Amino acid sequence: YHYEHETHAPLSPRIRKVGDIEFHACSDYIYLLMTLSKDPEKFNYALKDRVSIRRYVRKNQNRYNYFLIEERVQDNIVNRISDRLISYCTDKEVTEDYIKKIDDYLWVEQRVIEEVSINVDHAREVKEKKRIMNDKKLIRMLFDTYEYVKDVKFTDDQYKDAAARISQFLIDVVDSYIIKPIPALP
């Protein structure tokens, strides 16, 4: 008998930081949207203002002192954030109580990302790591647990979009299985 000895091994610090960066930048930007709720057009413009959103990402990279994010990775962080804006703020009145509730949806997604990343790190083959990143079944189950725990319910569309982001986020961010070339002697 070898219990994994214990649960939640050293979650990768990279997952922890990039996750914090992306989700706090998202929460912050949703706060902005809320302050623009009385000004349509500005509000509408902000939903897809990639330049501003990327500025929020940068600010958070500074706040969590983590500047190791490649441009392509950063581009998808911005994309995922904008998609969350449209998924969570494009109907209901973006009120103060509402964004407090959206923070729980963010929490749920960030927690599922972390949990799945743990299963990925523990898998042996890179092929299995990839299968896990894309395991919609595992994601659905982890989602049921955290939605319940945080008392929130994603609509089927919000859930399906979230599962896609999660798989995307893992592929873009996980680096624990990577072995780079030995550096030449320039």
Task: Count other C-beta atoms under 10 Å from residue 122's C-beta.
Answer: 13
Task: Give the distance, in angstroms, between the CA of residue 47 and the centroid of all CA atoms in the same chain.
Answer: 18
Residues 6+ positions from 21 with CB-CB distance below 8 Å: 57, 60, 61, 63, 64, 66, 69, 77
CB 84 within 8 A of CB 168: no
R_g (Cα) of the chain, nearest Å: 18
**Whole-angstrom distance, CA of residue 157 vs CA of residue 57:** 25
Which of 68, 72, 86, 114 shows the shortest CA–CA distance to 26?
A: 86
- For residue 148 the two structure tokens come to 């319940």
Distance CA 96, CA 33 (A): 10
**What's the token pair of residue 85?**
């804006």
Q: Domains (ranges, CATH) in the chain?
A: 1-186 (1.10.3030.10)
